[PDB]
C-alpha cells in the first residue's frame, strides 16, 4: 500500500516550515551498508508544521508525493522547499 498515510500539509512561514529535518542512519544488520532515513527531529511549538500535524520522531517517507527513500538530506530539503506555499509530507511511524 503506497498511499495510505495522510500527508502533513504544512504552510510556508516566510521560508521555514517550522521544523528540523534530520537525516538519521541505521546500519543494516548484515553488511556495512547503512539505512538512511529522513525524520523530523523537532517542530517549533505553534509552528506551521505543528499546525499541519507534523511531529518529531516520525518518518518522512514521501515529500509532495515523491519517494525520498534513498535521497540525500539536501535532496529532500530542496524537494520540500520546491513545494511552494504548502508541502505535503507523508509521515509514518519510526519503528526500528
Amino acid at each position: 500500500g503506497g498511499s495510505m498515510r495522510p500527508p502533513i500539509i504544512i504552510h510556508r512561514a516566510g521560508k521555514k516550515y517550522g521544523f528540523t529535518l534530520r537525516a538519521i542512519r541505521v546500519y543494516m544488520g548484515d553488511s556495512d551498508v547503512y539505512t538512511v532515513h529522513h525524520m523530523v527531529w523537532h517542530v517549533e511549538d505553534g509552528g506551521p508544521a505543528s499546525e499541519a500535524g507534523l511531529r518529531q520522531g516520525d518518518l518522512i517517507t514521501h515529500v509532495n508525493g515523491e519517494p525520498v527513500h534513498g535521497l540525500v538530506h539536501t535532496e529532500v530539503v530542496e524537494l520540500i522547499l520546491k513545494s511552494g506555499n504548502k508541502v505535503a509530507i507523508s509521515t509514518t511511524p519510526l519503528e526500528n
Binding site: 521555514k16 516550515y17 528540523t20 529535518l21 534530520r22 539536501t74 530539503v77 520540500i80 522547499l81
Partner: peptide, 13 residues
C-alpha cells in the same frame, strides 16, 4: 546511536 551528529545530518527547512 542513530541520533548522533556524525553521519546524521540536521538542517531546518
Amino acid at each position: 546511536p542513530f541520533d548522533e551528529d556524525q553521519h546524521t545530518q540536521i538542517t531546518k527547512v
